[PDB]
Symmetry: D2
Subunit: 253 residues, 4 copies
Amino acid sequence: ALFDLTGKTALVTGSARGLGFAYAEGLAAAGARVILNDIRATLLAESVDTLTRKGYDAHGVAFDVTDELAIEAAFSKLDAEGIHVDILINNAGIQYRKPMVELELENWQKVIDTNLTSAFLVSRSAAKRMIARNSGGKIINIGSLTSQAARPTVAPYTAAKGGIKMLTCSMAAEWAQFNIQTNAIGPGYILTDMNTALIEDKQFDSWVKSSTPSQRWGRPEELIGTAIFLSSKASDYINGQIIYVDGGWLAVL
Amino acid sequence: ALFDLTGKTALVTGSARGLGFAYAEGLAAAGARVILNDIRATLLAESVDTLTRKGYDAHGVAFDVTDELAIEAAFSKLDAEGIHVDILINNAGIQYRKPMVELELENWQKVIDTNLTSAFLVSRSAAKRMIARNSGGKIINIGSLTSQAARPTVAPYTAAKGGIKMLTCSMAAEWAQFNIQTNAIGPGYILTDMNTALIEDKQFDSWVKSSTPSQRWGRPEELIGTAIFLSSKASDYINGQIIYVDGGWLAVL
Amino acid sequence: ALFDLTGKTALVTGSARGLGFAYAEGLAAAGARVILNDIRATLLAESVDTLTRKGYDAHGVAFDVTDELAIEAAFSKLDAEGIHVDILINNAGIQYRKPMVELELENWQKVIDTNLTSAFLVSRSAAKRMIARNSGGKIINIGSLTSQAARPTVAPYTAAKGGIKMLTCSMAAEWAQFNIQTNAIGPGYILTDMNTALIEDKQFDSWVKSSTPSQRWGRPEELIGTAIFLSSKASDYINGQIIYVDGGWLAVL
Amino acid sequence: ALFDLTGKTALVTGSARGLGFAYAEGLAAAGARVILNDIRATLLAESVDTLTRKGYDAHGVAFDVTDELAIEAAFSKLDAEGIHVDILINNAGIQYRKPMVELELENWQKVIDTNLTSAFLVSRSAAKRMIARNSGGKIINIGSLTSQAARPTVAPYTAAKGGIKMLTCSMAAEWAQFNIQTNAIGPGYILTDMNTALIEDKQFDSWVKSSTPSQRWGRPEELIGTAIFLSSKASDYINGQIIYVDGGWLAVL
Ligand SMILES: [Cl-]
Ligand SMILES: [Cl-]
Ligand SMILES: [Cl-]
Ligand SMILES: [Cl-]
């Protein structure tokens, strides 16, 4: 069927918790075997087990998405185990809040590396194998509303996410001919454990509700449909697009 | 389930053939009851007949999408029959090929009215009823690659489709608060009977293939996934967005 | 000289008052002979005299920009004398505030005709002559922040202005080969007559200042530079672009 | 006066040759004192000595735009003397052509550092001073057509230029309140030394001319107006915008 992922294997980076974990559970529910990833082995193992206990075919491979050596070692392990990555979601990346005039280069660099460079490095390894197998493939990059409009105090993130939007186009340009579709999801303001300080702040909550015409935050499960869509046959002729899931935020002045 | 349309009734304008017909068949396959509309009543009945014979729950209502009196009469009839339109796809619109300096006002106007005003009028009637029911709803407008970049000789269409892109944002702005999601699809170059002169031209075919990195035309069934996506629970937190289905055309310089 | 408009004749529609008047004054100050057009003949003559008193070479031609016969008659007069319109600014267009579910078709249509259709008709007449003279030309359409993001209660204006954005791309597509550059200005929230109600509402004022990082409304003379820029040799290789003048509004999430 | 830069000092990075040198000469001609920059000192000297003999107020400061210690040294120096940088053009950056599957991380990183990180670092030093002085400022980042649409084989450049487009929005977002306007120029295909290979290839020349409706390459001085525009009072209410100078390329499907 159109949205069925049975027979496919997905790898989601930074998926021990947060939205990454939600993508992974969501793809599993659509029938994919899923491989979770995080830098912390022990945490990753707990998240893998939680999905296994739900009846999903879940696995974990721990690696630093900024370390090209670790990345290729991970894909070589997967190779040896006969595991083909058909779907990749590049969800890894950090946040750093600081005005630009006060921003340390080291922090700028870490945001760019974990958010933008990581997507190149992981996609490079995954796409090579998709190409070699002639199996086709799906690559989903994670953008942000900041792929389109900036937020003060998160400049390197904003720059990285604008870069992710265009990197998505480059992957379409170079790989679509091999039946690989690379697209992006741009999540709006979503209730996560990480955002909990934002949701708890009455002023910030009011601002979110007045900025999106849906008048509410999104929940992580509301991103699942878009992940499955962009991972399935339903998106075979979609390439280089970013889909914002923001209840209407970017649409409104 | 996430992409199941069982229990939902969809109205697709200009769906006697071409892309509109494909949306109607796609929604029906996902479980929707479908109401086809065209201005050509005899053609419409034939198309409805075709779908019923494949085992789909299909019906036809013929009306001019530029005639608000005809639209309200059509919706009133549906009301009297206990039929609730939960999904609206505004696919109606004509094309007219002529350079602007040679373009007569009546033809400019016919393109704007059938493409842009039609989406306002049909949506107004549909949205009024979705709001009064507090049933929620889905509205999908049909843009084009010309919602983003222009082609010579099709200016009023281009203008109309740029207008559709922003009208979609307006519908997000005004109706998202009533749990109505209004989004748009921008089809790329798709093989349909109407485009047959384009496909049969060697030069034009080569240009299409060298302009999209997928190196091929799309088929109408490759738009169905997006239509179901935007008509289903999967798009509950998506609003005011246009999704291009073009094999990567817009992504590449 | 790069930003000098001496020797050029510009026509500006809807220029009896507001931003249209400011555009006319600005082009004159840069050296252009200016022809002001409006449907309101009385104060049109008043505005022309004001510019004349200031030392500028201003003239008035009153006609309805939605009446193709009046347009052709006005240009035919300009033809019978030796007046070449080298620069056209399509500033004409009305506003109408009303939620879509309460919006009468009559008013939707008047907004579309006066904003979008007017720009096609006036440019068609102007471009034809520019092409025949083969002396190049400049056409500047007037968009809005709503060419990119919507506001509730102004849907036909938003649709019209999104249409203007793409119509601008069409004019570049069809006329750039004749050395005509067609671009657009998207004004933000400016202190002008058409915004008096907005400016005097304490809440709207506060909303404008919190939404643009410049924390203030623009002034009409802050649009003049962009107009002169798009009318001058400086824009010779700029075509189909819209420049927003909004203090940073669209740039900020 | 609206476009006069007299009384302003501009710093243009990577301006020993090519478009950066053009920008420098352009600003000087509009009245600015100009400071050229490159890593190559004696080449830079030759370039400065060239402008001085044409009677421009030109100066040069040599430094690596990826080296934060060197950048501060240059400013801390200028700081130590009586030099205020009022206009900054971030033109520095390199190209690297290579398919992503064949691209070494070291080269990806060099492109990112030289194009995107450099703009952050130089702007940081400049903006801190503009803010402290409270005399306003202008910052112009250099994007590319790849800020919007990708080209195969130049992915890190495309990602960096996408990043530049959004970094520009961040600078508006954070610094517009200090009367600093940050905007970007996106040059299309321009007749320069750096494009010699491109230009003298018949196939490539043909593809450029068929892809932009002006049917020609741009000339270096056709970028000057935009740089002066964005450096002058004409742009006081423009912030976070990118202006593409491409003859209409991006406007046409
Ligand atoms: Cl005609
Ligand atoms: Cl006539
Ligand atoms: Cl009304
Ligand atoms: Cl390499």
